[PDB]
């Protein structure tokens, strides 16, 4: 009950059934930003899929369509004036997962036209011989937080719709974000600047990212050297975006970056299930379950009374981005 009692007192403190959007903390003044709420949507389809309770889960499935209506009602069905690229394509990638739990077309429809959007207008060949721009207004700039969302959209869309074009994006994309965006060994570069070069900054949600993506492109292709890169990715995450005791970081002030442990943890839970699936590393996987497991045990070793937990998982207004990630937590 641990999952469907995190998210029953998630919904309680931040889901305000008027505007159907989130709150973006507990003083109810101001609601959850756009990228974001993508974040939250899908944390709504985690728990509807990890819940054994059937009422729960209904109720859930209504929040589905409700999380989509009260965005579309403050920002329109077409996203397409948005000048970050990123917002889109986390919507983009949500929407394909709210078409395969519903069955809806007017969701594949919203994931295809925005995935196509970016994909076919924002892809460049000629700055860092590849990768997509991060804004469609100004282009200075290709980073892993629209580069490996828009392939793990693109394996979403090739899994509903088996259209050769986007197992091809999925392959192309990724190919260049691990020889672009990554060192090679598992850190994932924030991004590339033109006039620049790399920015070798490495967070929790770009590791989760190239994380999934690498996944699903092992499960795609057959080809093992995927699931290297993903597992060589959470390995670095484990020793490296941790405190002196193996607690993920806290990575405020940034107000993106704090609740980055959400998309970390999701991600992460795909690599788990694939390692449990395929006995594939073995000694790697039974380490990374007990630090998973200890990091999840911590974090809620710090509910409040509400059963809210803030996103220092090491350490009295509680954020919905910050304290998702324990939700998400319980329900992988
Ligand atoms: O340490 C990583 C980055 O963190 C901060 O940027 C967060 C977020 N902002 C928008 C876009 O630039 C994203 O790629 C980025 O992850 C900021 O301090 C950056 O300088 C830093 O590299």
Known sequence: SDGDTAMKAFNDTFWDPNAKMFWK??????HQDFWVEAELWELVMDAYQHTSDPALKAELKTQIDD??????????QDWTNNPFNDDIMWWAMGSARAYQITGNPRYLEAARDHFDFVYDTQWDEEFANGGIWWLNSDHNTKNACINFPAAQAALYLYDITKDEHYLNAATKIFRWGKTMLTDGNGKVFDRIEIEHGAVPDATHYNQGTYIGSAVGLYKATGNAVYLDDAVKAA???????VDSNGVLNYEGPNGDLKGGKTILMRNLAHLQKTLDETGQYPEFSAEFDEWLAFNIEMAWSHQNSDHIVDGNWAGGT?????????????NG
């Not at 903390?25 to 101001?30: A, H, I, N, V, W």
């Not at 390995?235 to 975006?241: G, P, Q």
């Not at 509680?318 to 319980?330: D, H, K, N």
């Open 235 to 241: 390995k670095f995450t484990k020793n490296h975006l």
């Open 25 to 30: 903390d507990s003083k109810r003044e101001k």
């Open 67 to 76: 999380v989509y209506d009260g965005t579309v009602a403050k920002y329109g």
């Open 318 to 330: 509680y954020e919905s981005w910050s304290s998702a990630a324990a939700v998400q937590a319980l």
